[PDB]
Structure formats: structure tokens, C-alpha cells
């Protein structure tokens, strides 16, 4: 998760990382992807295993 | 916590480790104290 | 010696107060297993329990349907129709229209207290009663 859009010391390489064909996150979809495990259906789940 | 290896974990990594898991746990422990105590069976608390 | 000839009557709504026969509850082994057995009977069913209720006159009331026995519970309110004959056919109006699959509360309210509702007077009345 690229912590702001400024110089993280992590920040400088995830250009690097993501040619290996993987994804890093900027905090805006980390959150959307986490209130995701706070829908209904997930929360429903949750509530069983 | 950084440039804590092994020979260096003191005070800083045993009372962060309470921060990150003890006292969560102890958190936890609570909610399920306060929601037992008024006998709330059927509204659990999703912990992420 | 046979008590001279003895009629009881059994008042209906309207009498209502908050504490009713709860000075029974603390003494009779009887009683308690009434309100005791009846109570268990609301929690189980319905999510509520009938003693808070004339105890405490709780102004506001939320049923929660999270869990395996919360779905069981929403079931309970899902199924409870009114088969009016109403029209020359039948209608059958579904109580609690706010209660389907995807609900996970329901709220009563009242404006002073529940135990002046009549669902929950009503059964509070015939226990003290029965007790």
C-alpha cells in the first residue's frame, strides 16, 4: 500500500515490483477493497466460518 | 518498529507487541464481557 | 371444609403498570415458573424477553437477526400473516412487510412505553394473571 503519493522509501520501487506483473494499492483502494469485507453478503458469511 | 533485528528487540518490540496483539485480544475480550453482560446473542461484531 | 361458593374473574387491558406481579416473581417458586418458562419461550422465538419489558418499560425496542439463531428468529416474524376475508376472496396481509430475507433488525415503537403497546401488554397481563 503506496503510504501517501510523496517519496515512501518502499514508494520509489512498487514501479519495479508491478512489472513483475503484480499490483500495489494506493490507500484509496486498500480501503474501498476492506469496506468491501463490510457488505452484506461478506458480513453474512463472516457469521458462519 | 525498523532496523530492530533479533539482538536488538527491547522495550520499544515487547510494548509495541502489546499495541498489535495482547491488547487487541484484550479488546476483543471486552466487547464479548459488555455483550454478554446485557445477554446480546444475535448482533456480533465483525473483527477485521 | 369446602370455602364458601368462590367465582374468579380475570381482568382484561388497560390495568397495565410497570413492575406488575415482578413482587411475586422475587417469592413464589410458582410464579417464577411461569414468567421463567414464558420468557425463555420469547427469547427463543421472537428475540425479546417479556420480564425487561414489564420491568424496565423500555421506550424503544430492537430485535437483531445476526447469526444462526438471529435467522431462525427473522423466520418467526416472516411467517406471522393476517388471512383477512376481506373482499369476496380472502387477502392474506403479511405482518411486519419491513421483515424479509435481507433484514438484520426490527424496531417496535411506542411514544411512553412498550408494556402500553397491545402485543406486549397483552401477554404481560396474562402471565401476571396466570402467575
Same mark, same amino acid.
Given at each position: 500500500?503506496?503510504?501517501?503519493?510523496?517519496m515512501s522509501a518502499n514508494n520509489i520501487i512498487a514501479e519495479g515490483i508491478e512489472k513483475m506483473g503484480v499490483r500495489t494499492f494506493s490507500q484509496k483502494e486498500m480501503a474501498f477493497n476492506l469496506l468491501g469485507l463490510l457488505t452484506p453478503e461478506v458480513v453474512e458469511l463472516c457469521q458462519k466460518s | 518498529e525498523q532496523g530492530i533485528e533479533l539482538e536488538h528487540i527491547d522495550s520499544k518490540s515487547e510494548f509495541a507487541?502489546?499495541?498489535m496483539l495482547t491488547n487487541?485480544?484484550?479488546? #476483543?475480550?471486552?466487547?464479548?464481557? *459488555?455483550?454478554?453482560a446485557r445477554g446480546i446473542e444475535t448482533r456480533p461484531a465483525q473483527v477485521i | 371444609?369446602? *370455602?364458601?361458593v368462590t367465582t374468579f374473574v380475570f381482568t382484561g387491558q388497560g390495568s *397495565?403498570? *410497570?413492575? #406488575? %406481579? #415482578?413482587?411475586?416473581?422475587k417469592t413464589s417458586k410458582a410464579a417464577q415458573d411461569?414468567?421463567?418458562?414464558?420468557?425463555?419461550?420469547f427469547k427463543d422465538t421472537?428475540?425479546?424477553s417479556i420480564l425487561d419489558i414489564v420491568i424496565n418499560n423500555p421506550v424503544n425496542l430492537t430485535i437483531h437477526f445476526g447469526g444462526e439463531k438471529g435467522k431462525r428468529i427473522r423466520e418467526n416474524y416472516s411467517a406471522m400473516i393476517f388471512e383477512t376475508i376481506v373482499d369476496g376472496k380472502l387477502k392474506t396481509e403479511k405482518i411486519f412487510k419491513e421483515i424479509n430475507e435481507h433484514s438484520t433488525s426490527y424496531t417496535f415503537?411506542?411514544?411512553? %412505553?412498550?408494556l402500553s403497546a397491545t402485543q406486549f401488554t397483552q401477554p404481560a397481563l396474562t402471565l401476571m394473571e396466570k402467575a
Open positions: 500500500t503506496r503510504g501517501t503519493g510523496l | 507487541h502489546r499495541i487487541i485480544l484484550r479488546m #476483543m475480550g471486552c466487547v464479548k464481557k *459488555q455483550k454478554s | 371444609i369446602e *370455602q364458601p *397495565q403498570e *410497570q413492575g #406488575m %406481579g #415482578m413482587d411475586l416473581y411461569v414468567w421463567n418458562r414464558a420468557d425463555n419461550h421472537y428475540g425479546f415503537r411506542s411514544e411512553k %412505553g412498550l
